[PDB]
Design a protein around this nucleic acid. Structure first.
Ligand SMILES: [Mg+2]
Ligand SMILES: [Mg+2]
Ligand SMILES: [Mg+2]
Ligand SMILES: [Mg+2]
Ligand SMILES: [Mg+2]
Ligand SMILES: [Mg+2]
Ligand SMILES: [Mg+2]
Ligand SMILES: [Mg+2]
Ligand SMILES: [Mg+2]
Ligand SMILES: [Mg+2]
Ligand SMILES: [Mg+2]
Ligand SMILES: [Mg+2]
Ligand SMILES: [Mg+2]
Ligand SMILES: [Mg+2]
Ligand SMILES: [Mg+2]
Ligand SMILES: [Mg+2]
Ligand SMILES: [Mg+2]
Ligand SMILES: [Mg+2]
Ligand SMILES: [Mg+2]
Ligand SMILES: [Mg+2]
Ligand SMILES: [Mg+2]
Ligand SMILES: [Mg+2]
Ligand SMILES: [Mg+2]
Ligand SMILES: [Mg+2]
Ligand SMILES: [Mg+2]
Ligand SMILES: [Mg+2]
Ligand SMILES: [Mg+2]
Ligand SMILES: [Mg+2]
Ligand SMILES: [Mg+2]
Ligand SMILES: [Mg+2]
Ligand SMILES: [Mg+2]
Ligand SMILES: [Mg+2]
Lengths: 176, 104, 159, 187, 49
RNA sequence: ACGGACCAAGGAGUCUAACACGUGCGCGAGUCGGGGGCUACGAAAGCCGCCGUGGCGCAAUGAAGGUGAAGGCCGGCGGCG
RNA sequence: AGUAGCUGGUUCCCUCCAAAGUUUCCCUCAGGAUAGCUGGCGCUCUCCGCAGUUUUAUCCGGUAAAGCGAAUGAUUAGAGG
RNA sequence: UGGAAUGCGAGUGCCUAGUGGGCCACUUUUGGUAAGCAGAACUGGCGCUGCGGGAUGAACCGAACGCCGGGUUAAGGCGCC
RNA sequence: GCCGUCGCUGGCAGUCGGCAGAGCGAGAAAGAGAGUGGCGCGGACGCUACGCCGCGACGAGUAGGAGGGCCGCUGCGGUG
RNA sequence: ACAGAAACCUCCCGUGGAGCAGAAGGGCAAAAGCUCGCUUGAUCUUGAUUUUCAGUACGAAUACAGACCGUGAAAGCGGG
RNA sequence: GUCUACGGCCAUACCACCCUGAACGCGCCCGAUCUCGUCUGAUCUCGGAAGCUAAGCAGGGUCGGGCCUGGUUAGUACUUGGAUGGGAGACCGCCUGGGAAUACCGGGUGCUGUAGGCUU
């Protein structure tokens, strides 16, 4: 899986194909964070295969649909439990992020896990995602935004329009 | 000096240029290699086939007579269907006349 | 290089299976082979007479000659870029009736009956096989049970 | 690029006679038109054979023409051969035939005509049988040539009845070793 | 009669995808182009047809 | 790695014989006069026919002595039964 | 004009098709013969057959892995008689 | 009811050159400490082959080539060269 | 777009004219049939048939093979 | 009993852990091993086939076929 | 329910031990004149019918060993095809498909053809 663009949360339901022994096999569900649905179904078969004697040939996808964020206009803290392979082992991690959508927090996770650990998305298995209350957060980087009277300036504002004009008579100002 | 010893590299590529053709099959195979004692009698069976020639004619004609005698006793949408009928050059020949006559 | 020995490389091929050595069951000798029959060649090491050559072990041929103890088999052999129809004499211990055509002969009889029976009943029945089609649309009842949620398990060094 | 082989693009077949004969080409012009402008496949087959080489146009013997023209249902049909009708002295009685050929040997003409038969030329067949109706197309034996004795498995291989190439024939000429068990082997 | 109607059609000669491809050398699910992309073939067909 | 400073002219799959297959032409169970003879180009061409001797083909096979290329039915008789 | 399985050279244009360094035999290893790979000439048909593919049936196999409180072989440690 | 899918016109015969030093890559693999080493299997390549990218390069990546215009791409890229 | 090759073993002899009558590309076999009874004098080009015309696909090449040269050199028979 | 680790006799267990000329692998238990009895299929003969393979030779081998035989009560087996 | 003769497949049928076996069988069993063969009538062969199910044999039993068959092992190990994936390597991950075997746990413990008997 390539963590291309902002990921989406998918609800994927599958089962074993019915057989004479078990005319109605049980249904299984998974939360899949993927770029599109075609990827979402592929990763489902990769996870259920790891947990059950199942695979695409001997099973079917009963339902694939996007799970929309329930409060996209509200700030939340997310706790993400994941395991990943490094160059020399496998590790479990718990990470926290502040976002508006759960799929956004997961996308932050992939970009962050790539930045801080050189982890490609094919080695990362997100186990669990939960919305966490400000009192239950552990990471100091997230907790410092739990401040009802938060305030801070924007020092040394870098000039981003550096080629319009390309040549100018006046030097830029970084204080605003 | 020393050289390469053996390889089959490039050999399945050459074999398939003119195809690995299967052997030709005829409906009559040669009796070469069959049991000499059994082949001797088969030749004798063929050699006297003509002995029962008259008997075969009588049965075949008799069998034909019975065979002939037994025989001689024994013997999408309704709109689109209609349009497909009219558009048929033969079947719709009269129908096309009817619409033309009425049109006039 | 290797040797050109007749039985080189047949240590396992011609050996008898596990705890299946000893006497050869006599039903092996009671089978009836007729000209045109399809037989699977399988060398049996218990009988060293009329042994098929290793290249013919696991090939399937056609009977063309029948003698007191053996049969003549026309079996394709590929040598380099050509295939040769080879004629071998193999004692009937080292062969068995091929069941590859039996499924076909069963189908021919079933086909003809359906063809005959349907003809007198004025109906068109399917006769040609078909590849497995994509499965048709269907409903999956949940029976008021939420699908079980699955999650990946944590890593553990169970070393 | 397209994945295709080009070794079989050009079909090897005659589109015209290698012969520069002007009378042969006048017949080819005649039957080019007939083959094109009629739905008759007899015209197409004749046209094709006018292109064929000498060894693809074997001569038809008089005896063989009579044998094939004597089969039931072939009465009063025109025998047509794109080739030469040779004579067969081994025949005693010649019936009344009606034949069309490119050539007829001098002695075969007298025998055919003396029996009341008729000898056409392929320009006369077109006027008589524009579509080839009522004809019996006949061919001489194609493997009736000394060369086909020498073709097949090489003479020194088992069950190879091929004829070898020997300057002279006799006891001293390729009969010792490989042709009898007494000298080495036989196969 | 899909077989007859389809073989009657010559193989469609499509143009290079306008807008490029992601990576022809890997599967679609890997962020490439090869393999089954299900209904996502239509987006490709618009850019090539 | 070797030949090549530069320019011109010269400079290397030919001819005879044998064989094989393909193609073209003539005649055709035949065919061929090549050796011989007759009657400026011309040493050519034309002709021979009781000049076809002869070659190749039309018969193979065997070491050789040698042999050497479809049958069936009807009626009658002798023998065996 | 000795022979050379060895070195060097081998002369105009366009169009089409397009290799092999492999098999076997050889006083064979810098070379030949042989099959394969190539080209050319066709011919016999056509407008059933075939296939460097899958499907469905049915056989063949002893490598990957696994086993050694199963045979063979190698091998560590205690325990009970 | 030409009895699975798919695709495709096939069969056949003569004559035949060059070749018979190979080498490289994924995977598998023998010897060797290893080697741009020696020896194998499979496929694909270079040899015989240009072209875009890898600055440069027999083999890597993309893609194979009649002479052109427009458009779009692959692999690769987008400070300046 | 143009060049060539290959394929359709494609089309054109119908320029059938005042002794005339203009067609045979059209989804779906076989006749623009024959009959017996109930003013003007006109109408392009073509077709070296080894010629001309149409449609579709294709085009790398050493060693090597083949074809075509209204490519080129010298001499002979004919012809200009 | 002499007789002992080992002589010979007896009973029991014993899937081959023995033997089958030889290298190894395969095969084999009223046998393919061991012991007796009779014997010369290790004889005469034409083709087909397999292995190496070029689908050539030899060598070796496989099914038959036609004679003479051996053995066995016989079915059969045997031309090393 | 079951046996005898001849079998097919050849352990679900074998091996160890225990229990029970009506009828007919199959046996053990009693002899050596004859046939036949032994050092030995033990075996083999022959002639029998006093006794006995003791044994063979049949059925059953055993938290039986084996064997057959499932579960687990495990979608694990291994693997076909893919990438200008990771890593200095050793190797590893992912994509597309296939997919094992121990230990451990459970279930089972001959079926059957031809002919002929016994079993009210
Ligand atoms: Mg070499
Ligand atoms: Mg091209
Ligand atoms: Mg080419
Ligand atoms: Mg070619
Ligand atoms: Mg653009
Ligand atoms: Mg690649
Ligand atoms: Mg030099
Ligand atoms: Mg110099
Ligand atoms: Mg010069
Ligand atoms: Mg010739
Ligand atoms: Mg002179
Ligand atoms: Mg010289
Ligand atoms: Mg000299
Ligand atoms: Mg040399
Ligand atoms: Mg020698
Ligand atoms: Mg050299
Ligand atoms: Mg092995
Ligand atoms: Mg292993
Ligand atoms: Mg190497
Ligand atoms: Mg070279
Ligand atoms: Mg090439
Ligand atoms: Mg290239
Ligand atoms: Mg570089
Ligand atoms: Mg361009
Ligand atoms: Mg070219
Ligand atoms: Mg015995
Ligand atoms: Mg015999
Ligand atoms: Mg009792
Ligand atoms: Mg006694
Ligand atoms: Mg008891
Ligand atoms: Mg048990
Ligand atoms: Mg029982």
């Amino acid at each position: 899986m390539k963590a291309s663009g902002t990921l989406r949360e998918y609800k994927v339901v599958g089962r074993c194909l019915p057989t004479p022994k078990c005319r109605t096999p049980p249904l299984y569900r998974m939360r899949i964070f993927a770029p599109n649905h075609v990827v979402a179904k592929s990763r489902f078969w990769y996870f259920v295969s790891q947990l059950k004697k199942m695979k695409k040939s001997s099973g079917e996808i009963v339902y694939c649909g996007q799970v929309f964020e329930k409060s996209p206009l509200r700030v939340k803290n997310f706790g993400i439990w994941l395991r990943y392979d490094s160059r020399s082992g496998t590790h479990n991690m718990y990470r926290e992020y502040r976002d508006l959508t759960t799929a956004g927090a997961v996308t932050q996770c992939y970009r962050d896990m790539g930045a801080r650990h050189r982890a490609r998305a094919h080695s990362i298995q997100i186990m669990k995602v939960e919305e966490i209350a400000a009192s239950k957060c552990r990471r100091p980087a997230v907790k410092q935004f739990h401040d009802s009277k938060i305030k801070f300036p924007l020092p040394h504002r870098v000039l981003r329009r550096q080629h319009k004009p390309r040549f100018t008579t006046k030097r830029p100002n970084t204080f605003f | 000096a020393k050289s390469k010893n053996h390889t089959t590299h490039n050999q399945s590529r050459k074999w398939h240029r003119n195809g690995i053709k299967k052997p030709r099959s005829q409906r009559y195979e040669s009796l070469k290699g069959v049991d000499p004692k059994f082949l001797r009698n088969m030749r004798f069976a063929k050699k006297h086939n003509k002995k029962g020639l008259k008997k075969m004619q009588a049965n075949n004609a008799k069998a034909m007579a019975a065979r002939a005698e037994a025989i001689k006793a024994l013997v999408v949408s309704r709109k689109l269907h209609r349009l497909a009928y009219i558009a048929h050059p033969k079947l719709g020949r009269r129908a096309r006349a009817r619409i033309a006559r009425g049109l006039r | 290089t290797n040797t050109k020995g007749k039985r080189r490389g047949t240590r396992y091929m011609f050996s008898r299976p596990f705890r299946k050595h000893g006497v050869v069951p006599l039903a092996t000798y009671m089978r009836i082979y007729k000209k045109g029959d399809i037989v699977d060649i399988k060398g049996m090491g218990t009988v060293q007479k009329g042994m098929p050559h290793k290249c013919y072990h696991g090939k399937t041929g056609r009977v063309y000659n029948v003698t007191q103890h053996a049969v003549g088999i026309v079996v394709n052999k590929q040598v380099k870029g050509k295939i040769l129809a080879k004629r071998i004499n193999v004692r009937i211990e080292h062969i068995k009736h091929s069941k590859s055509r039996d499924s076909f002969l069963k189908r021919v009889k079933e086909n003809d009956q359906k063809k005959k029976e349907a003809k007198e009943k004025g109906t068109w029945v399917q006769l040609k096989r078909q590849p497995a089609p994509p499965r048709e649309a269907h409903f999956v009842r949940t029976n008021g049970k939420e699908p079980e949620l699955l999650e990946p398990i944590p890593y553990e060094f169970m070393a | 690029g397209v994945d295709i082989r080009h070794n079989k693009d050009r079909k090897v077949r005659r589109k015209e006679p290698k012969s520069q004969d002007i009378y042969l080409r006048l017949l080819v012009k005649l039957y080019r038109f007939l083959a094109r402008r009629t739905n008759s496949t007899f015209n197409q087959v004749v046209l094709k054979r006018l292109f064929m080489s000498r060894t693809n146009r074997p001569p038809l013997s008089l005896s063989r023409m009579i044998r094939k023209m004597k089969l039931p249902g072939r009465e009063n049909k025109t025998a047509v051969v794109v080739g030469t009708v040779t004579d067969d002295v081994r025949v005693q009685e010649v019936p009344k035939l009606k034949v069309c050929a490119l050539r007829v040997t001098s002695r075969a003409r007298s025998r055919i005509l003396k029996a009341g038969g008729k000898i056409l030329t392929f320009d006369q067949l077109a006027l008589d049988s524009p579509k080839g109706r009522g004809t019996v197309l006949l061919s001489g034996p194609r493997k009736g040539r000394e060369v086909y004795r020498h073709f097949g498995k090489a003479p020194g291989t088992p069950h190879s009845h091929t004829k070898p190439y020997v300057r002279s024939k006799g006891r001293k000429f390729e009969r010792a070793r490989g042709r009898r068990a007494s000298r080495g082997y036989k196969n | 009669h899909f077989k007859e109607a389809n073989n009657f059609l010559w193989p469609f000669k499509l143009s290079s995808p306008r807008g490029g491809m992601k990576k022809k050398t890997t599967h679609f699910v890997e962020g490439g182009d090869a393999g089954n992309r299900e209904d996502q073939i239509n987006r490709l067909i618009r850019r090539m047809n």
